[PDB]
């Protein structure tokens, strides 16, 4: 839950 | 706790060659991770820290990259004074959390 | 910059023995203290630190209560001592530096000395 | 890499490379989010992104008491959707991993606006005590005007943020020359600082001299460092707390001189209680350094923000059968430039 | 068919009105429609006025020792009485046959933009009337509207603005959520409803409940609330809260178990004399009365920051062994059903 | 004739004034007329200015060591000294020629249209100097009224404007009303009065009071008090008040007697030292002085929002067997005679 | 005193 | 809706005689409840009554001290005692309700029980 | 203080079709604050009118009352067979409450 | 307008002899009182006074101590008592008035009489 | 302590003369100062007041005016029921401070 | 330092 994080991809 | 595991455990590395070592993770970090090398006996020095962070005066042939819960520690040409072990820490959460070292054999 | 540390010896468990760390090129008020502890054929392992700005302290599981830390700032030196000694806290000792703005990583190391303890 | 947030419903998201912004007194990096949802879900409605910055006291979860004194200091807002400056490298590289649900929108912060600061509570003085916010909300409604929902919302909080600037400045040093009333005996005192800047935790040290041509003997020396704050939210207001402090009866007989270099340390830990203390924002709940001292923009502007901080030392002479006196020399104190 | 009256100390000026509470539809309210007794020969010379005004107000009138009357107005106007300056209502004229040629009337609008009359009960260390807002009138002679007061020459007076009980029923109101912990998939679901969006004053609530436990723990025990909120906009947005009825109860809820069950509740006042900040429907000057309406707002947006607003609602938590205690809330309307 | 004059530490920046209070007719006031010297070298091309205030404070100047200093000014004027830019007066021209051509003159004129410098009694808990409204005049010399000021650069001044007894008396203050009981017709009249609509500060005042008790119960006590109403228009409109002199007696009227006597009171500070917010004329800096004196107002309605003021009134009290006192009051003037 | 009623007439 | 009472009959004076009146149809906390007697050749008469949501009770003076009443509101149901029994006191006695907004008059009533003592 | 009560007339002749009025006289001025019963003799009291005008549900239009400061007044306009019975009124402006005493039927 | 003295006469030292003076024409809570006292071939000292508004005493070094001075305002009148009597407390003293805004010098003034004590 | 000294002591001057009797002090006061008359073994009574401000109900021959420490008490024609001694008092600080008195004497 | 004087000359 709260914040969460991710990729660029490519 | 925070469940670490390196690997692999040894390797030949004639001077010249380009290698992987990697540190698994029981649980997501983002950054807070950093390894070190060292001469058995002496103290740790580091070479990368926030996953990505070369230290300074760090010959630019060590690199590495995260994913997620895996992080990588590359080396692109083994040299004959970096024969030596290595080892891993993460950081996110106390206490800290670290990997067991690795051979040189020829 | 140097750390230079003091104290040990093979001693026969169940006392205590103190531990003394100072440093030069750096205040403490900047700064936070950490040891950490290897064995034959094994690593490093963290067993506490100090945190001087904010006043806090930590310890493993393995050594509370038995282990107790300080520093003056009078000195820019730092200590711990740790208590019914016993062969399974026989182990090379280092103490360590950091950045307090931000933690990333120790950058700098005592010579880091063993300390052992049995019968034999 | 990239952060994410997301409704209650799941259905609305927001995407976002930043958390903490620089002023450079000219400029501070543009807010250039994206937002995700598949308006089948809406089906009607109209999405919208909002901003402020809002002075707060009082925490949101559910406190039983007077609270959310919510003036706010400015508000903007934009539409994600239906369509109406032009994407970034990253909002366009955000697109092309999202898909064409992901709609981007963008704001620019004004130059004059606070920076995130917090007061210390108090032991009764309890929950979440007054601040200055930057915080962002998106949501979905037919209009502005109809009451949102948390299926339909998706909130976040943000910071302004300040760095050492690269010139130094003048050396800072006072004196002044006490004469008495009977004849031209005198005491004159004088003192100087490492620096007019410092970063936090750093040692100060003082250099401190007394000519004493009076009748008297000077008894004791003081020194401390005191912070300063201003609020100019209807009306101007100031409040103030010595930080750290040192004596010593460092004796000055009258026809002698004396000179010495003392130091000090300005620290959190021994003021945990000192309810009214300043600390630059924390996120939602954290620890964090004694306020850094804000740097002002080299023009006059309308100074009507917020709330502003700045230190100073003071020293003062204690001398026998009376006749103390003390001065004062201000400087600076915050975060060197990360790299 | 009574009619009020109120009158200055020397009598000699005197008013009358057929109402003191008015009530508001959100698209209109009922006129001020009253009428003003006086014969000119003791004043002569004076010009005759009367005055509205909506007041927010602390501390009594009556003799106080202590800083008081932060008299911020809301809303005020002014009519001329005397000399002669729409047309005269039904009972204005048969009031006026009645009185005579020296009654003389006079007329105001109330718009639709303004708060109802409500006031906050004091603590046992306050004194005096604690802080509210009031409507109220005033006439009196002088020879202008700044120019001085006198007691002989003026009159006062009070009134109120009320709300009463739509015709047209909404929604049922329920509200659930799901509750998982980290270990795995395994949830835990929490449902509540209630009888109906309205209700009067006195009466009983019924919370239906539901529990789905799926997770890894057993809840423990189980709270339920009602709540009232308030706002407060006079010069800056604020908020006041207070729990007004609240029931603790033991059941529970194993792990791969399901539960539900119903309970009831009662808002009233006897309990709660002491809780300082409660809110009240406003009395006239110092009667007992009923915990405060649930003030309607108009179906337009407005500037909605005037005075006083209110609102209430219910909250259900759930109480677990080994953590995780969670709740959910949900809001209703109360106000007294519309008069015969 | 002597002449006052103040300089800035670095010496250089000096004024002159021959003047420290000034005289309110509610038609004029006479102007501030000093005169500023500086060589400047000093400066070496900085611009000078002298600046006006009146100033709401509160909180000590004094190193204090708490939240304080709620400026809100009310009034401000500024003006340049040099370079230069309403004609002198005698004793600006006089001073001119005393000092020589570094010293130059300025001017304002206070408006109409503010208060009198007023100040209230601390109380023991609280600390350092009450809140309080005062005139203050300062020069500095800057290149613009936006920089940051020094001390060597500026040099301050603190000064108060003020009222005396008007020459004109007027009518006698007396108050009386015919009240009774429900038993019957039977009535209880009362009555009182003083001996002027003026005094001076610590002369006694005598109340003429009379008693016509026709009703059905006998009087049991007299009391009298004379009270301080003081009003504040910062941004609310808001009252505080004190009873500050007080006496009483057990006199008797029976049922169908009458009755009369004359008593005597006199204010005084003495006994009142900690009664906090207690009203006092504007001293400089620290000193004792008298109660605050009745500020008069204009003729004119006005508006006057300017935070502090002030009036006294006279109140009698009948305490009377089985039940049924009551009470009335009535106001007066007090401020010092014109001086010499 | 207070407040008081009165009548129709008529 | 409905409205029933017990408790006794013809007693020695002196004592005390507890009785009771449960309701039905509505909830007594938006309601109040009164008891009423008349007698031989007599009509009605208060003698004292509850309020559930003010808390508030008054008495008649002929019985204050000497009598007591109470409600639960978990049985919707009123009660009173009161205490050392006299013949004056025969009476036949009333339980009845009213609107606690507002009260007009008393708008259902108990079938109402004898009490008598010598 | 006790609101001092005395309802008027005592007893006449009914036989079915009549007008007639009853009322009721109080100590001191009361608003409206009143209302008036009938019952027959051993059965419960039941209300007829309140705040001296308000007619209650379901009750024949034979019955009305008025008000005039101290005086209160019912009307009976048509006598009926039915409503053969005894009267009350009673009067609460101030608690205690306070009423009258009854009426005859005698043919 | 008048002022008045009481009490003296030649007595034996370090005893007590008290003074008294009433006033006429002016109100006592408006105004201030003093005593000075004089001697043979010689000026005039302060003493002591008293202001009644504020309620302040001020003393002599000389007289610190010995020297207590009073009034009430039922009477509109001034006393003060002193003791420990020297000899050269013998003296002719004063009794005098002031205005209290603002003070402006002694504008009228007792009769005042001889007090001498001696062995 | 404040210092006084007036000076002269006493010289003589029949009937008409002008002459000044001058009052010094240790430190400055801005105007805190007046003088007296009085014949021997009577009340003193006051001349100059403010060092300046003549009392009223004295004639003009009085005058006087300050510079700085200095006070200046003068005469432009003395009188022939004047001669007497003459008193200078100031009272900036408490405790007041006097002088030594000035036998001025006919010839 | 304070308050002071001077002259008119």
């Known amino acids: 839950s709260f914040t969460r994080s991710t990729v660029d991809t490519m | 706790d925070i469940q670490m595991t390196q690997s692999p455990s040894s390797l030949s590395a004639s001077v010249g060659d380009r290698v992987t070592i990697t540190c698994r993770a029981s649980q997501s970090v983002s950054s807070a991770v950093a390894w070190y090398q060292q001469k058995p006996g002496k103290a740790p020095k580091l070479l990368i820290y926030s996953a990505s962070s070369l230290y300074s005066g760090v010959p630019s042939r060590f690199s590495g990259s995260r994913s997620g819960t895996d992080f990588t520690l590359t080396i692109s040409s083994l040299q004959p004074e970096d024969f030596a072990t290595y080892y891993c820490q993460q950081y996110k959460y106390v206490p800290v959390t670290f990997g067991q070292g690795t051979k040189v054999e020829i | 910059v140097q750390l230079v540390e003091s104290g040990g010896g093979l001693v026969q468990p ?83 530096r950091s950045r307090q703005f931000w933690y990333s990583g120790l950058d700098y190391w005592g010579q880091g000395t063993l300390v052992t303890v049995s019968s034999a | 890499r990239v952060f994410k947030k997301s409704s209650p419903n799941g259905k609305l998201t927001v995407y976002l490379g930043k958390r903490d912004f620089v002023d450079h007194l000219d400029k501070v990096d543009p807010v250039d989010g994206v937002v995700l949802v598949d308006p089948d879900y809406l089906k009607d409605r109209k999405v919208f992104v909002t901003l402020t910055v809002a002075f707060r006291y009082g925490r949101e979860d559910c406190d039983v008491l007077g609270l959310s004194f919510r003036k706010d200091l400015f508000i903007a807002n934009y539409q994600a959707f239906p369509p109406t400056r032009p994407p970034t490298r990253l909002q366009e590289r955000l697109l092309r991993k999202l898909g064409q649900h992901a709609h981007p929108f963008f704001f620019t912060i ?16 309890t929950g979440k005590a ?83 041509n009076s009748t008297k003997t000077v008894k004791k020396i003081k020194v401390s460092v005191r912070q300063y704050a201003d609020i100019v939210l209807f009306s101007t207001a100031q ?101």
């Open chain 3, 14 to 96: 169940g006392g205590s023995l103190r531990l003394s760390c100072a440093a030069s090129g750096f205040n403490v008020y900047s700064s936070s203290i950490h040891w950490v502890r290897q064995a034959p054929g094994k690593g490093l392992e963290w067993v506490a630190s100090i945190s001087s700005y904010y006043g806090y302290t930590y310890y493993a599981d393995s050594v509370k209560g038995r282990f107790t830390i300080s520093a003056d700032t009078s000195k820019n030196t730092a200590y711990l001592q740790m208590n019914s000694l016993r062969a399974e806290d026989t182990a090379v000792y280092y103490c360590a």
């Open chain 4, 110 to 125: 004004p130059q004059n606006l606070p920076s995130s600061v917090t007061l210390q509570p108090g032991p009764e003085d």
């Open chain 4, 130 to 212: 007054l601040g200055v916010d930057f915080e962002i909300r998106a949501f979905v409604a037919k209009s502005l005007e109809e009451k949102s929902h948390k299926r339909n919302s998706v909130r976040l909080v943000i910071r302004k943020v300040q760095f050492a600037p690269e010139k130094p400045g003048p050396q800072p040093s006072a004196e002044t020359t006490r004469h008495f009333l009977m004849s031209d005996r005198s005491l004159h005192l004088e003192a100087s600082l490492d620096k007019e800047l410092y970063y936090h935790g750093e040692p100060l040290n003082v250099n401190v001299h007394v000519t004493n």
């Open chain 4, 239 to 339: 409040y103030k707390v010595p930080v750290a402090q040192v004596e010593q009866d460092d004796q000055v007989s009258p026809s002698s001189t004396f000179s010495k270099v003392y130091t000090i340390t300005p620290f959190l830990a021994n003021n945990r209680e000192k309810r009214g203390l300043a600390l630059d924002g924390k996120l939602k709940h954290e620890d964090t350094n004694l306020a850094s001292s804000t740097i002002v923009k080299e023009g006059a502007n309308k100074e009507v923000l917020g709330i502003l901080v700045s230190y100073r030392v003071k020293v003062k002479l204690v001398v026998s059968r009376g006749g103390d006196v003390s001065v004062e020399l201000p400087f600076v104190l915050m975060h060197p430039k990360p790299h």
